[PDB]
Design a binder for this molecule. Structure first.
Ligand SMILES: [Cl-]
Ligand SMILES: [Cl-]
Ligand SMILES: [Cl-]
Ligand SMILES: [Cl-]
Ligand SMILES: [Cl-]
Ligand SMILES: [Cl-]
Ligand SMILES: [Cl-]
Ligand SMILES: [K+]
Ligand SMILES: [Mg+2]
Ligand SMILES: [Mg+2]
Ligand SMILES: [Mg+2]
Ligand SMILES: [Mg+2]
Ligand SMILES: [Mg+2]
Ligand SMILES: [Mg+2]
Ligand SMILES: [Mg+2]
Ligand SMILES: [Mg+2]
Ligand SMILES: [Mg+2]
Ligand SMILES: [Mg+2]
Ligand SMILES: [Mg+2]
Ligand SMILES: [Mg+2]
Ligand SMILES: [Mg+2]
Ligand SMILES: [Mg+2]
Ligand SMILES: [Mg+2]
Ligand SMILES: [Mg+2]
Ligand SMILES: [Mg+2]
Ligand SMILES: [Mg+2]
Ligand SMILES: [Mg+2]
Ligand SMILES: [Mg+2]
Ligand SMILES: [Mg+2]
Ligand SMILES: [Mg+2]
Ligand SMILES: [Mg+2]
Ligand SMILES: [Mg+2]
Ligand SMILES: [Mg+2]
Ligand SMILES: [Mg+2]
Ligand code: NA
Ligand code: NA
Ligand code: NA
Ligand code: NA
Ligand code: NA
Ligand code: NA
Ligand code: NA
Ligand code: NA
Ligand code: NA
Ligand code: NA
Ligand code: NA
Ligand code: NA
Ligand code: NA
Ligand code: NA
Ligand code: NA
Ligand code: NA
Ligand code: NA
Ligand code: NA
Ligand code: NA
Ligand code: NA
Ligand code: NA
Ligand code: NA
Lengths: 142, 132, 156, 337, 172
RNA sequence: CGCCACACGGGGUAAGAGCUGAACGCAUCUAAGCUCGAAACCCACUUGGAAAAGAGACACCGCCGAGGUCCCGCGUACAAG
RNA sequence: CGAGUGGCUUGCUACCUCGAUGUCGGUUCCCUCCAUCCUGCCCGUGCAGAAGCGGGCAAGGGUGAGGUUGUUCGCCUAUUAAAGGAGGUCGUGAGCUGGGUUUAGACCGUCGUGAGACAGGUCGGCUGCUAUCUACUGGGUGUGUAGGUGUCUGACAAGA
RNA sequence: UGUCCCAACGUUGGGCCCGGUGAACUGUACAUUCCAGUGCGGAGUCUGGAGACACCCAGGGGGAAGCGAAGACCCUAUGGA
RNA sequence: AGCCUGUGUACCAGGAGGGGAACAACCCAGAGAUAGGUUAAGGUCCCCAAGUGUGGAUUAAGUGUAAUCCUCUGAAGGUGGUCUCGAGCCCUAGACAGCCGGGAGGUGAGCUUAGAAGCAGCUACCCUCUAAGAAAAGCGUAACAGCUUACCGGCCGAGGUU
């Protein structure tokens, strides 16, 4: 609820990792960022394998635990954490001043970062974060 | 198998020595197995009323002794619950030697028999003197 | 025993029979097959060319040679062709069959050393290459990957 | 060779800790099929006695004959839906929107809540209806509560509150239905929801037994043979293998046993009556005498005498309902002796 | 590459984005034609399948799009039909169409009826021991036929002995 | 040792059975697309779960007073708590 | 004949420990692997059916009770859908047991001049410790979220 | 015949809370760990990740190659008896 | 064999610092203090200093993002997955494929054999009509029939085949 994002990024039809990479780089420069339409972000690859990885991540674990998100919500955020030294003071700060949302709760339309967009016309081997989540068993709350 | 029309508490185990309620020449029986039964680690295979068991002849005529025959549990000392909530228990544990087709190897059945046994083994039943 | 035990050319040359005894006999039956009465007067001459220096146990040779010749009976027991295995198992081989104490092994067999690109087998045939098939079955029983090469034959 | 054997106890009811609310909280509700209606009701366990019935089962070779059934008696006096709570769908699941309360409150509902003195029923009702219009209205449920005072055998007067979902035809039709119920005084009865012969899922916090050993807590064996005389009798062989070098949570250990919530599926409602017909001579042991609205549930029911139990129309029944079973006899013989 | 398909006078074909719809006296069929760098467009009188690449995988699809479209043309006009013949040896097999799904009863003495749901606007008209599956959508139809035949599939016993079942008699 | 209760059904797949279909006019279950299909996978169901640091939501009561601790009689609870 | 995978068997090596990392078997209790014995779905058949045989996916669940032997293994019996195998310090002695191995007593056989020996057999022959840390099972007290009561949500977690 | 199937309940002394009395073993340091990897090839401390708010009570002992004993086995000593 | 035993040499031992995730001996590098600068190995999407650098091509397997190595496996054998380069032959006198039509007669050749008629076996394999058409390449029949290959013509239209 209410997040003064100096920058709002739209992930729709954007390569998750390429977005995450830049979103990290900015948050570490002190920028408050909000990622919008997570459920519509995409990651290239053969769907079947891609789901095997993510599914393997949900299954990993023991008493100590290995909490892995199922919602395209977390998925994106965990993807971004992996690009920040989240256990240092600086990093945790940069990670906390960032937020990912399902769809868009703002009025403004997010911008599209350069080099993160995927042309659906010249591309068929890719997957939607949402699609991934539905397989993992999440609750399509979007 | 067909529903016995009752709830049974297996009063017998493998190794158990019961009475041979018939005139086959077999006096005593030794329970060796229980048809269709699979227990659990450490659990002694249990057999009760209306169960078709495999047996070995402990006491009787020389030619009947040591033979591995099949049979049916006709009576037990441990109580059995009938549809109306009553309990029924007998004076001993006895069974009757039977064949491949489940027909009594003998001619006559000595002593009483639980009605329930009828609903599973006709010929055995239709061979009974007293059916409680 | 496995080929992995003697397929490499990493030991010195061990061939002097004047200093070796107890050499098992070669399992290889013949080196000249087909019409050995006639000479290489054939139109077509294909060759089985090995692609990596290796050692080939007389075991492998016999099995590789039979499999091809035995198969070259798509042409008849007295067919018109001449088959040739130009290598002989000279290199003697041992095995240490005490642990590593006094481990110089005891002669257990012989193997022929083939360098990569040499032709181990040569067949002569008129435009009737069933031979090309006799060799897909031969390099099937030798360690190395092989090249089936045709020399005099532009009747493609 | 080491024979195989299934692990001891289930890992589906854990952790095995004391329950948060002595009052049960369903985490699943029936499907919205028939007409609008409250999907639940409660009461207080009293005890057990048997009843003779007419084989009702059509596929039974005994259908039509006598048959003794064990029944747990449950005092199910009326309850009161004091409010209608609305939930809105959101990117993060369902969230409570607002509530519609009443003014008529049971004399002693303030022993638990801070009863409303100023509430705007219509604004609430409006807010909801504007949500529905926008189509962000999530399911609808009623804040209800019991009247322990109606039950003499139960010492408490402080009411037990619990939210219960209302399933009905259209959302609009059941929204209204809800409001109607609340507005009155919220007063409803077991008859208004269940009918004898139907199946219901009975929730409730089991009987507590404090800390217990693995043998009883998980059903692991006792030490056998000579092993039982050596200084170990009811302790398990080992807490695990050398590696991994840690004790895995799946290994049976001592702990809090009992007083856990349990939702017991497909219980048949043998009869819903009123009076003292089911009561036993001398009085139900450690409970008292029954004489008012009650229910007769087949079999057993989690929890100890006096505990609040919760009913719900079975969510996954196996049989078809065979309404109003003929009861030829109910035993009133003393539960003492 | 670029292929041009002249649409039949009997037909109208429109297309927005990756979806193509063809309408004729026999009906309308829409299809998604999506493949890397392959543009499909309705140029007034002709449908054009074009791409800037020529590697085998592309040409492969191009050809697939072509036939796909032509099959649409054919469907909205002449249509598609598959002929089928119910056949039994001992148990009279009863095939009826009930709702949007054909039902087969008493198959091999079976008490439990066997059924399958028809696909799309496919008509399964049954007359005696003959069936006729028809529709403007070849995909739907072809599958409806196939399913029907599959519905009497048998694995448990010898097929050469147990031949009961409905089979495709005539392929469009 | 007694008694009661413990699904089905959806969704996506493996092997596999097929549809449409090209590269390769034909053919082809696959390359693009699609129909089906395992006790296995997801959901369903039970149980735990605001310490989920994005540390939640709602209603009412209260901020000089709402509610709570101690106190007293007891347990549907309990090794202390 | 040729190419491999595994790390259950056996051997090789002598890297790790001789100011000690308690032995074999069993037992108890927990997790796993698939190269699948049963159970589900399939393909082939020298597939009529029934019963099989071979093969593919699949590790969710199951895989039990006994007679001789310290045995692992294995032999044997009767049941069984089937009575699969393997890893976890040949899992598991700050858990058990102590039959075997492997002390001191003693016998027999073989060897030895002898003391005495045995990769032979045999009878007898001991199982320590109050848990600091960590781990987990359950149970509390605080602090953070920032006045109270009641009712929930559900990120995720467990299940056979 | 409770050795077992298969465990139950009960009795007494402890155990748990309170008053009083009041040790010892052990301790290079640090220490909330888990999954992998690496390393003299058997890591709470290295490396990568995961998890982890602090304190306390009881428990049964998985790990600290836990504590206890300069290894009794084996070899070596121009050792001893 | 992270085995045993030589040899030459450089290193560790006794060698810091930079890189390699960590890691005696692999890469740079041999190092008094402090200071500024420029590089070496290695690296430039983020974690993380520096390119989401340029021209061009391949790969769809997450292959791969792994110099060396106990450490990074992957082999013989297979692939109309795809890209590139070459050679021979055929083709608008119409190729390659598909579809249509034709596939005739002497004659069901002789011989054997009850029988055999393209097709059990043996021998031969001749000429007519024609734009084609075997004394028949594969099925099929008890033997016939029937179904097709070879061979010819048509439709079609561009490259095709090895
Ligand atoms: Cl976990
Ligand atoms: Cl970090
Ligand atoms: Cl693509
Ligand atoms: Cl048995
Ligand atoms: Cl034990
Ligand atoms: Cl120097
Ligand atoms: Cl990946
Ligand atoms: K040692
Ligand atoms: Mg046992
Ligand atoms: Mg003891
Ligand atoms: Mg009583
Ligand atoms: Mg009584
Ligand atoms: Mg069969
Ligand atoms: Mg130890
Ligand atoms: Mg497998
Ligand atoms: Mg498992
Ligand atoms: Mg035993
Ligand atoms: Mg061990
Ligand atoms: Mg074990
Ligand atoms: Mg010990
Ligand atoms: Mg231990
Ligand atoms: Mg101890
Ligand atoms: Mg002993
Ligand atoms: Mg002994
Ligand atoms: Mg002894
Ligand atoms: Mg703080
Ligand atoms: Mg770390
Ligand atoms: Mg020493
Ligand atoms: Mg000694
Ligand atoms: Mg001396
Ligand atoms: Mg030194
Ligand atoms: Mg930077
Ligand atoms: Mg890889
Ligand atoms: Mg390499
Ligand atoms: Na990707
Ligand atoms: Na996980
Ligand atoms: Na020696
Ligand atoms: Na080879
Ligand atoms: Na003891
Ligand atoms: Na004792
Ligand atoms: Na140990
Ligand atoms: Na399914
Ligand atoms: Na909170
Ligand atoms: Na290997
Ligand atoms: Na080994
Ligand atoms: Na030591
Ligand atoms: Na042991
Ligand atoms: Na399994
Ligand atoms: Na045994
Ligand atoms: Na032991
Ligand atoms: Na011990
Ligand atoms: Na006792
Ligand atoms: Na421990
Ligand atoms: Na040096
Ligand atoms: Na380094
Ligand atoms: Na990868």
């Amino acid at each position: 609820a209410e997040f003064d994002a100096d920058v709002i990024v739209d992930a729709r039809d954007c390569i998750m990792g390429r977005v995450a990479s830049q979103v990290a780089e900015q948050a570490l420069d002190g920028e408050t960022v909000a990622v919008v339409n997570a459920e519509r972000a995409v990651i290239t690859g053969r769907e079947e394998q891609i789901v095997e990885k993510y599914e393997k991540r949900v299954d990993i674990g023991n008493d100590n635990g290995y909490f892995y998100p199922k919602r395209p919500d977390g998925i994106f955020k965990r993807t971004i954490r992996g690009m920040l030294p989240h256990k240092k003071q600086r990093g945790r700060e940069a990670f906390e001043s960032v937020r990912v949302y399902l769809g868009n709760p703002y009025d403004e339309d997010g911008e599209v970062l350069d080099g993160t967009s995927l042309d659906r016309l010249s591309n068929i081997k890719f997957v939607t974060l949402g699609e991934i989540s539905e397989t993992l068993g999440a609750n399509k709350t979007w | 198998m067909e529903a016995l029309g009752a709830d049974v508490t297996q009063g017998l185990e493998k190794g158990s020595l019961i009475t041979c309620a018939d005139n086959t020449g077999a006096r005593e029986l030794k329970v060796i197995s229980v048809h269709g039964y699979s227990g659990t680690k450490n659990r002694h295979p249990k057999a009760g009323l209306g169960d078709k068991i495999t047996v070995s002849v402990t006491k009787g005529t020389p030619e009947m002794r040591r033979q591995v025959l099949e049979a049916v549990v006709v009576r037990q000392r441990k109580p059995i619950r009938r549809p109306d909530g009553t309990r029924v228990k007998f004076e001993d544990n006895a069974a009757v030697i039977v064949d491949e087709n489940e027909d009594p190897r003998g001619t006559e059945l000595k002593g009483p028999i639980a009605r329930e046994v009828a609903q599973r083994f006709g010929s055995v039943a239709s061979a009974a003197t007293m059916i409680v | 025993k496995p080929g992995a035990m003697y397929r490499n050319s990493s030991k010195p040359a061990y061939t002097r029979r004047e200093y070796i005894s107890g050499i098992p006999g070669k399992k290889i039956a013949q080196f000249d097959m087909g019409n050995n009465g006639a000479g290489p007067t054939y139109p077509a001459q294909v060759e089985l060319v090995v692609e990596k220096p290796v050692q080939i146990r007389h075991n492998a040779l016999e099995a590789a040679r039979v499999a091809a010749n035995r198969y070259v009976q798509n042409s008849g027991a007295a067919a018109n062709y001449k088959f040739r295995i130009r290598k002989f198992p000279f290199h003697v081989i041992r095995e240490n069959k005490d642990g590593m104490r006094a481990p110089f092994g005891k002669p257990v067999g012989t193997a022929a050393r083939v360098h990569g690109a040499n032709h181990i087998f040569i067949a002569w045939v008129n435009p009737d290459p069933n031979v090309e098939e006799a060799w897909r079955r031969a390099k099937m029983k030798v360690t190395p990957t092989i090249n089936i090469d045709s020399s005099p034959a532009g009747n493609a | 060779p080491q024979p195989s054997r299934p692990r001891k106890g289930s890992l589906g009811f854990g952790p095995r800790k004391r329950s948060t609310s002595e009052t049960p909280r369903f985490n699943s509700w029936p499907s919205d099929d028939g007409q609008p209606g409250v999907q639940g009701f409660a009461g207080y366990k009293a005890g057990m006695t048997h009843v003779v019935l007419v084989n009702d089962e059509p596929n039974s070779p005994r259908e039509g004959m006598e048959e003794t059934v064990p029944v747990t008696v449950i005092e199910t006096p009326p309850m009161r839906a004091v409010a209608l709570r609305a939930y809105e769908d959101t990117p993060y699941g369902q969230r409570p929107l607002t509530e519609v309360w009443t003014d008529e409150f049971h004399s002693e509902l303030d022993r638990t809540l801070d009863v409303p003195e100023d509430h705007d029923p219509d604004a609430a009702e409006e807010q909801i209806r504007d949500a529905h219009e926008a189509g962000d209205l999530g399911d609808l449920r009623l804040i209800t509560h019991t009247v322990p005072d109606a039950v003499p055998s139960v010492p408490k007067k402080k009411p037990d509150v619990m939210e219960t979902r209302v399933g009905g035809g259209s959302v609009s039709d059941r929204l209204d239905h809800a409001l109607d119920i609340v507005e009155d005084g919220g007063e409803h009865a077991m008859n208004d929801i269940f009918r004898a012969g139907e199946y219901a899922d009975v929730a409730g916090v089991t009987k507590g037994k404090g800390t217990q050993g693995p043998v009883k807590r998980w059903g692991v064996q006792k030490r056998k043979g000579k092993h039982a005389r050596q200084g170990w009798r009811r302790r398990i062989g080992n807490l695990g293998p050398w590696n991994p070098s840690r004790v895995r949570s799946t290994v049976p250990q001592q702990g809090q046993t009992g007083y856990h919530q349990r939702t017991e599926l497909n219980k048949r409602l043998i009869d819903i009556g009123e009076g003292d017909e089911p009561t036993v001579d001398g009085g139900f042991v450690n409970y008292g005498e029954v004489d008012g609205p009650y229910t007769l549930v087949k079999g057993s029911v989690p929890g100890p005498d006096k505990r609040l139990v919760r009913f719900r129309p079975a969510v996954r029944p196996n049989d078809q309902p065979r309404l109003d079973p003929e009861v030829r006899y109910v035993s009133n013989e003393s539960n003492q002796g | 590459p670029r292929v041009e398909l002249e649409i039949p006078e009997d037909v109208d074909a429109e297309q927005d984005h990756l979806d193509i719809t063809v309408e004729g006296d026999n009906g309308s069929v829409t299809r998604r034609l999506w493949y890397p760098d392959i543009d499909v467009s309705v140029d007034g009188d002709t449908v054009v399948i074009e791409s800037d690449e020529d590697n085998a995988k592309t040409m492969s699809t191009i050809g697939t799009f072509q036939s796909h479209i032509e099959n649409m043309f054919h469907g909205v006009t002449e249509g598609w039909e598959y002929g089928m013949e119910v056949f039994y040896s001992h148990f009279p097999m009863q095939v009826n169409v009930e709702g949007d799904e054909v039902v087969i009863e008493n198959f091999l003495g079976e008490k439990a009826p066997r059924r399958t749901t028809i696909h799309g606007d496919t008509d399964v008209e049954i007359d005696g021991e003959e069936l006729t599956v028809s529709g403007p959508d070849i995909e739907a139809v072809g599958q409806t036929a196939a399913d029907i035949e599959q519905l009497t599939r048998i694995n448990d016993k010898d097929v050469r002995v147990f031949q009961d079942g409905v089979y495709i008699t005539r392929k469009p």
